[PDB]
Design a protein around this ligand. Structure first.
Ligand SMILES: *[C@@H]1O[C@H](CO)[C@@H](O[C@@H]2O[C@H](CO)[C@@H](O)[C@H](O[C@@H]3O[C@H](CO)[C@@H](O)[C@H](O)[C@@H]3O)[C@H]2NC(C)=O)[C@H](O)[C@H]1NC(C)=O
Ligand SMILES: *[C@@H]1O[C@H](CO)[C@@H](O[C@@H]2O[C@H](CO)[C@@H](O)[C@H](O)[C@H]2NC(C)=O)[C@H](O)[C@H]1NC(C)=O
Ligand code: NAG
Ligand code: NAG
Ligand code: NAG
Ligand code: NAG
Lengths: 190, 191
């Protein structure tokens, strides 16, 4: 038999992952073999679940640890395995600050910021906070980037000859990252 | 008649408290600070004696988002001159209302000024203007944070020409943000 279609692996907690698939079409009579397997440690479990149900909760997992998962259908006959799905369980700790922070392309009313995030901490978003560097500080701007794939952003409509303070936070299930230092940005008309 | 304490300041601490601080003082004894507070909305006035050698009273047993007028004096054998009125709202127990008078204007290819207005007495400490592209893609959005309720306008800058933005505008407060029933549309020009 062919493996389950529509296989999707999502982290629902710090110790649990949820594998879902599309309902299997029956003659008789079958079950779904699910194999999950840790990367950071040597830990494989193998679960049999009745064919008519559509998902399994994989539980008793460790925090911020990635697991590789595959599945199949057996009858009788041993079905061919699905492709390997991977996922991290949610973080137990606060996420690390984005590394390789590079401010460049500095213009009169714009600049480009680039960074790198470490995978493994369930970073769901990053925020780019920028404000005028003066001692007043009555307002700032948060650019909220909701997909952690994006590695770069261009700030726009900045004021010329102005010094800005720029910070970059990464947010996960626990909370935001804590920056030790900010970054400077000075525009030029010229 | 002695003059009142100097450097009088009234800070809202909680929903039921305000803190009145002043510059401490030290002829012959004894002396105490008479502090009066009174509700604007309700009819609730109280008179509090505190010994003259401490620097602050916490005026307690007040009601949520209620305005209060405060004054003070230094009494001895004779009663002193009253201070000027201090006024403050206690912190709110609800979310603030959405800002009315949302007038967008001066729309250019990369600029779009926005002005609003807020109702006082809700302890509104900041307002957030949010703006993203009209598309349903939840990739990016920009939260402009304005940390004083004094500021009434703001000019958006560096927007993309010929584009539709979905502007929201929240008001924040000791409980939480306001809840917009509706967003606002912003077209941009050529360029
Ligand atoms: C793992 O996977 C998903 C969530 O990530 C869960 O599937 C769902 O579970 C219940 C149904 O028992 C519901 O919350 C979801 O909707 C259900 O099916 C339809 C939805 O159209 C409704 O008519 C039902 O009333 C019912 O609510 C359901 N969602 C889907 C798409 O299947 C699953 O429970 C979760 N946990 C485990 C332990 O498997
Ligand atoms: C009322 O307000 C003032 C200022 O917030 C408080 O005075 C402070 O007291 C603590 C020590 O107990 C220190 O932070 C300083 O000595 C004071 N600060 C200043 C700025 O003077 C006061 O304690 C508050 N509460 C009461 C009940 O009086
Ligand atoms: C799967 O089959 C078993 C047979 O006992 C039944 O208990 C269960 O409700 C079935 N689930 C379905 C049809 O979703
Ligand atoms: C910024 O630098 C990169 C790499 O050279 C390139 O996109 C371009 O030269 C610059 N872009 C500007 C100034 O808009
Ligand atoms: C004020 O004087 C009284 C005298 O009973 C004393 O209890 C209190 O500690 C004094 N406060 C000071 C010196 O701050
Ligand atoms: C309109 O925008 C331009 C350029 O951004 C600015 O110079 C001008 O002051 C604005 N006009 C008003 C009436 O706000």
């Amino acid at each position: 038999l062919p493996p389950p279609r529509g296989l999707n692996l999502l982290p629902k907690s710090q110790t649990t992952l949820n594998l879902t698939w599309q309902p299997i079409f029956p003659e008789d009579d079958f079950y779904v073999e699910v194999e999950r397997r840790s990367v950071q440690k040597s830990d494989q479990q193998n679960i049999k679940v009745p064919g008519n149900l559509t998902s399994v909760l994989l539980n008793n997992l460790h925090p911020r640890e990635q697991y590789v998962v595959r599945a199949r259908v057996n009858t009788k006959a041993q079905g061919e395995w699905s492709e390997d799905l991977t996922a991290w369980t949610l973080s137990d700790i606060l996420p690390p600050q984005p590394e390789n922070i590079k401010i460049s392309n500095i213009t009169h009313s714009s600049a480009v910021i680039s960074w790198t995030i470490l995978d493994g901490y369930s970073i769901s978003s990053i925020t780019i906070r920028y404000k005028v560097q003066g001692k007043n500080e009555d307002q700032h701007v948060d650019v909220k980037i909701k997909n952690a794939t994006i590695t770069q952003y261009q700030l726009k409509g900045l004021e010329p000859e102005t010094a800005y303070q720029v910070d970059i936070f990464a947010e996960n299930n626990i909370g935001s990252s804590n920056p030790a230092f900010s970054h400077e940005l000075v525009t030029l008309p010229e």
